[PDB]
């Protein structure tokens, strides 16, 4: 895979961690915070030849102590699925 040009390692994850707290993670609030964090990067996340998506999820889950697939599962439970409000789709993994 190509090296993701977005520096996920050093981004600010507080929009997610402040709104999405466990162990009873609120599904709608968690999905919304994840979309708010990740939807600006659909261009890079949806580059299937890059490691952007796997890198992003690795840091979300590391910094927030979240189970892998949590946000993918929660958003797929929601009315909008993994769709960003501007129309693009976030990858599940
Ligand atoms: C990351 O952003 C933090 C602010 O996030 C916003 O405000 C909070 C209250 C919440 O609403 C969130 O959704 C918003 O995006 C910011 O506070 C934090 O900075 C760190 O803490 C502050 C108090 C300073 O000490 C600063 O030096 C710290 O870095 C941001 N974190 C980083 C690592 O930049």
* Number of separate domains in the chain: 1
CA distance 30 to 16: 7
12 Cβ below 6 A of ligand 1: yes
Backbone angles phi, psi at 55, to 5 degrees: -65, -45
How far, in Å, is the centroid of ligand 1 from the Cα of 12? Answer: 8
Neighbours of 22 (CB within 10 A): 12
For every residue of 72-89, which 3-state class applies, written as one string?
A: HHHHHHCCCCCECCCCCE
Which of 12, 13, 29 to mutate for ligand 1's pocket (most ligand atoms within 8 Å of CB)?
12
Measure 15 CA to ligand 1 centroid, in angstroms: 9
Burial 36-50 (b: 16+ CB within 10 A, else e): ebbbebbebbebeeb
Resolution of the structure, angstroms: 1.4
> Which residues 6+ apart lie within 8 Å of 19 measured at CB?
29, 30, 32, 33
For residue 64, the enclosing domain spans: 1-93
Residue with tokens 């990858």: 91
């Amino acid at each position: 895979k190509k090296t993701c040009p977005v520096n996920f390692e050093f981004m600010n994850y507080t929009i997610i961690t402040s709104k999405c707290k466990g162990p009873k993670y609120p599904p709608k609030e968690c999905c919304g915070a994840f979309k708010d964090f990740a939807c600006p990067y659909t261009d890079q996340l949806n580059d299937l030849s890059s490691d952007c998506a796997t890198t992003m999820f690795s840091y979300i889950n590391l910094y927030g102590k979240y189970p892998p697939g949590l946000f993918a599962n929660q958003c797929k439970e929601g009315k909008e699925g993994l769709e960003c409000p501007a129309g693009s789709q976030l990858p599940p993994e």
